[PDB]
Design a protein around this ligand. Structure first.
Ligand SMILES: [Zn+2]
Ligand SMILES: [Zn+2]
Ligand SMILES: [Zn+2]
Ligand SMILES: [Zn+2]
Ligand SMILES: [Zn+2]
Ligand SMILES: [Zn+2]
Ligand SMILES: [Zn+2]
Ligand SMILES: [Zn+2]
Ligand SMILES: [Zn+2]
Ligand SMILES: [Zn+2]
Ligand SMILES: [Zn+2]
Ligand SMILES: [Zn+2]
Ligand SMILES: [Zn+2]
Ligand SMILES: [Zn+2]
Ligand SMILES: [Zn+2]
Ligand SMILES: [Zn+2]
Ligand SMILES: [Zn+2]
Ligand SMILES: [Zn+2]
Ligand SMILES: [Zn+2]
Ligand SMILES: [Zn+2]
Ligand SMILES: [Zn+2]
Ligand SMILES: [Zn+2]
Ligand SMILES: [Zn+2]
Ligand SMILES: [Zn+2]
Lengths: 118, 118, 118, 118, 118, 118, 118, 118, 118, 118, 119, 120
């Protein structure tokens, strides 16, 4: 499943939009991101140097979520995710990749705009 | 003409301010940016991996607008423009190099603050 | 479609050959090659640092026609097209990617052999 | 004093959180940041390519204040400070390193949030 | 915390030996290693590109364990752990760093000699 | 042919595991591995700087056999094969890519464990 | 044999010219160029990404024929041979190194000028 | 002198054409290229690894004639002149820079097309 | 005045000589070299890792004074001034760029010859 | 003597084999490897970060032993010896460059198989 | 160990070298564990060389083991203009190699230590 | 000739010394150093442009960097072989052996000229 999806997006002139369109067609989210095991809740920050999932999130290994790293192609913006950990609201933890693609980290508090910001 | 302006800004201890003051004295906007021939049905985002100009914008070539890339010098952010496409509000496509400098991209929208944002 | 073709050529031992075979079987050429907005009174040369299309050509962004560049793989000849602009005969413009693969630039006049040369 | 603190934060899994706790527990701010000798008539923006302190600020050599550059370790995000100059409210010029970690630069204003912004 | 131990070793002319000697003297093992969720019984191999823990092991993040990566110093061998995932026996898992150091991976089995091999 | 398979592995989170399963499901082995013209009087060592096939082996160009170099993706461990030559037991020469993946090169004899060591 | 000639060439101010003069002094050609086991039904072009020899040529591992790659020195070309395969007229397979040095690939058809061209 | 012209061309979106129009207007050619003392006489090739001047040519330092090199900007071609020696027809030794730009080296004999080829 | 001078010296075959001549014609020295506000309790050495000015000198940011760094071009010798701090005799603080060009650091005491040496 | 051998092996398609055949023909071992003046109280491991020789060994500088490093050519393993120290049984210390080529380190105990191992 | 304390100190100092200087000035113990070479001791006697060149009045140490910066795992201000090379040191000062290379200079003419060889 | 000498130094543990004894044994100096065609220069030992004077020859920097001729890394106190890309002025009376001349001489840090040939 992931190969068809990742293949389709990898060669599209715009990977991000290929995925977006794909999901909009009812396509299945990219699975197999790595979930981090935490013994304590963290700051709840979007992207961090160490796992920081709080009561409402889950922490995945950065690269594991970066679509470009997953598609093995160059970056738009290096995975400003690679080597770090991404916190995702649990309600959206079903599509980590798509999530970071569709959201914005707050520059002030550093949490997802719309989910735990301000 | 471009050479006189760019030569001027290129050796300034602060290029951006140089161009800013240059224009402030009635100077003429740097020209020769490359315009993309698109359908104008884009997302309207400020900076994108492919032309995404809507009906009130023009799509220029990244490097064409990055002052530093034009001055062949280092950056103070790499041409977060280079290799991408900048959408500029039609009413401001007479000074692309200047537009990007003067304006901010809404981190939430992806659109230019004050021109499309919200 | 594009992904389909691009994927097939991407992993073939000889990408260029796979695209030729593909075409020779009536496959649709690769699309989404960005086109430049230029005067059309250029030198008409095959590959240039700024759009140089004459009346019988179309200018495209070099990278968007570089099959390797498109596929995200190394090169045979980096593809001498990236960062430059390719001028293509309007009649052949319907397949930029293949056109550059099947043709040759004159070392002497810099135009496509058979479409501008001598 | 400085070496004790820096050593402690460097080998931490999260240097920023370490330093933050060190201070919280009544630790003395990292000293030895280089202060620039300016006119104090500058724009007053947070991080600039040339000293821009105003009357209520002090200008420091970027690197001097980047905790990561002081610890000799890789970076989160290189020192988006290395090479630039950091303007800091005089009331806070006693802990430049920590000030830049606790505060955020307005992407529109270019000035410190809560310290000049808007 | 872990920083006093890491500081010692980082400046030793032989970190690996320093940490061993440290532990020998009753020193506390280095903590703060990251664990990941293994999606259904792994092969049990010691070092993999994806979590691969057995029902007897736990999967830690490579770099998180490589002592040289924790001490921010170059390597002997780079972190044939970095970017990968290290599987460690649950009952030896209180000292991830030490374990990888004290043990050898079978070049045949791919499992730890003494803990899985043959 | 190879594109379907290769495309399927390149995007899996564990290419090797994927190719393995593919083969398990009866999939056809990857082909088109450049085969060398040797005398078959060589050392008979697994991986070497020049073709060294003995009477029981065939020689191939390293890269034609490294799944990673064939999928145009990065390496776990560069192709310990790239640039060198891989000796493959003739009976197993119909699946060179797979062979190198399942076998272990003896640190002493220098030959594949089970197919020529001791 | 080879060590003597290559050593001689490698330090000359013009390695190519040195080999040429050598040969003309009745010098023995450089031997030990990897020979490919090919179908002998290839396009027949000079330098290819895969063995393309025809019924009148042999296919050698490029790098084994690049004098500079053989002398371990820099290039005046970058071994547009290294990594590729060189098809050489069987009646000349006795001096693959010298052939490429002496001959020229036609830019239009890609075949050795005067050995298959036009 | 040379600064007025080199600066002018340096910032032009098409440096080559700039120097061309400059000359077309009676502008003085870029001077100050280094001349190599080529006692005896070389092969007469256009671009060589050591001076090869004829009775009818002068040998200049590769860099000295590389417009991009003399301008300190990137290239459309490093310039294949740098570290090389260029042989130019005595009658044209008054504008080395512009010469290389206006002329072409024969791929077969290595000599300037029109000025030595055949 | 800076961009005019820098421009002139940047395209000269010898920046340093060009600036020297520029000065000998009553040309105004390059300005805008950042200075450090220190305690003037330094060793008074020529080039240091931290401000070391004594009562008779000013401390400048190395890069501000490295003519090439200011001219944005390669270097004869790695700006040995870049990242460092240059001490300059007060009575010469009016032409920092030039000072470092005209003077030499004693290899024994690390001070400017004829300004604190021996 | 050294330069002859090294030169001989340097240009060999298979250097290691070349040096082997050289020795086998009663050739004199490469000399001038650097011995470490240490107290022979080390762990006696094959390759280490600090001299580790025991009473029955000699410690040499890694690089001075790596044939490829002595030949200035690339590698097949880089110089997993360079920067470290190699312990060679005293009774073999007359041929350091060879001993490492001919022997294997135990992946478990870390000593030379057949000279300390187990 | 012993050196880790003094090295941890200098490493984070704004001027590592100066920090080590102050350390010794306070009676601190010189850094140890510099690797020593076994050579002819009839060498050129030059300061920094590509192969051991100690004479009868010197000792040859392994550059890197003597470059404080390389020892503190931090970037350099002078890579080690010593790394890969060998350092000849007056036998009388062989007790503090790391400090010696900091406090002394090299005859740009004779390649020998100013004060111990030159002229 | 050149190849023999260079091959000999190229693999020596100390190229500079290898060549030193080679010459000592009456060996012949390395040849083929691009001689520059120049005017009235400063006469400074190493420059970015031919700066020879009436008593020197200006050669191409690399042509004289032994290491740069043997194809091996360089010992020069951390860096680049400070000749490559530049131009070396050598006293005409010694131009018969440029490679060795630089090896045997020192450039005055103050006046930028060869110690013994123009310095002070
Ligand atoms: Zn990424
Ligand atoms: Zn917020
Ligand atoms: Zn830019
Ligand atoms: Zn918005
Ligand atoms: Zn390409
Ligand atoms: Zn033509
Ligand atoms: Zn930083
Ligand atoms: Zn604001
Ligand atoms: Zn590591
Ligand atoms: Zn096993
Ligand atoms: Zn590979
Ligand atoms: Zn074996
Ligand atoms: Zn080559
Ligand atoms: Zn042809
Ligand atoms: Zn160039
Ligand atoms: Zn011709
Ligand atoms: Zn510089
Ligand atoms: Zn002095
Ligand atoms: Zn090596
Ligand atoms: Zn063992
Ligand atoms: Zn160092
Ligand atoms: Zn002296
Ligand atoms: Zn060199
Ligand atoms: Zn002098």
């Amino acid at each position: 499943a992931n190969s068809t999806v990742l293949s389709f997006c990898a060669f599209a002139v715009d990977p991000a939009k290929a995925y977006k369109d794909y999901l909009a067609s009812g396509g299945q989210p990219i699975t197999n991101c790595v979930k981090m095991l935490c013994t304590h809740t963290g700051t709840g920050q979007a992207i961090t140097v160490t796992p920081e999932a709080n009561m409402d999130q889950e922490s995945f290994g950065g690269a594991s979520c970066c679509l470009y790293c997953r598609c093995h192609i160059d970056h738009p913006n290096f995975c400003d995710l690679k080597g770090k950990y991404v916190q995702i609201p649990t309600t959206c933890a079903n599509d980590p990749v798509g999530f970071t693609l569709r959201n914005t980290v707050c520059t002030v508090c550093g949490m997802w705009k719309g989910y735990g910001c301000s």
